[PDB]
Amino acid sequence: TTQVTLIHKILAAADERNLPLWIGGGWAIDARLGRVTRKHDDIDLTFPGERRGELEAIVEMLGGRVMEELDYGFLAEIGDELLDCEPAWWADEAYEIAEAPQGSCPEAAEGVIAGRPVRCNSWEAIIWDYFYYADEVPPVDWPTKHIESYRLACTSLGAEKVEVLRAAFRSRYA
């Protein structure tokens, strides 16, 4: 419950600032499912890129700190819990993660974590990051927890749609 408690505190502080934040990765899967499916190593977040200072402020207020600057964002820590944070940028009608499919950061809260509505990245954005993962790390070297979470996300979106998205990913990076 430590992680869930932390997620709730982070989102509460963000709500208070009218700061949208999207849960990502494994917690986004569990949020859209509305069920906790397994243990999650970190908490993945997407934030408005131009309001990064506000997220850092939340981290600090909760007793944490920025730990690392990453190629795609930053890592912060609160207690022993890691926050893996990626910016999204305003694109006329929504925030969008760089290089990701349109609709990556939906405005509506489309998931639930322990009764609490949460904004979360789209299924397409979630699966897109598995495609990257497959290029950066061969799948038969993936830890099994990611093999399984990928299959779950695919079953939720649907194999027909995943096939088309994967083809688009290949074409993009052809």
Ligand SMILES: NC[C@H]1O[C@H](O[C@H]2[C@H](O)[C@@H](O[C@H]3O[C@H](CO)[C@@H](O)[C@H](N)[C@H]3OP(=O)(O)OC[C@H]3O[C@@H](n4cnc5c(N)ncnc54)[C@H](O)[C@@H]3O)[C@H](N)C[C@@H]2N)[C@H](N)C[C@@H]1O
């Ligand atoms: N939007 C553009 C970026 O998209 C991707 O970047 C991911 C990043 O990999 C991802 O972080 C994962 O990868 C990092 C290494 O680069 C690790 O340090 C993070 N703990 C990891 O987060 P985490 O382990 O929580 O996994 C979150 C998701 O991401 C993928 N993933 C899972 N494990 C890996 C891995 N070792 N390398 C690459 N991708 C990985 C899976 O699809 C997973 O659902 C961020 N949480 C979101 C970000 N969108 C591309 N790899 C790089 C690209 O520039």
Ligand SMILES: [Mn+2]
């Ligand atoms: Mn991981």
Ligand SMILES: [Mn+2]
């Ligand atoms: Mn994660």
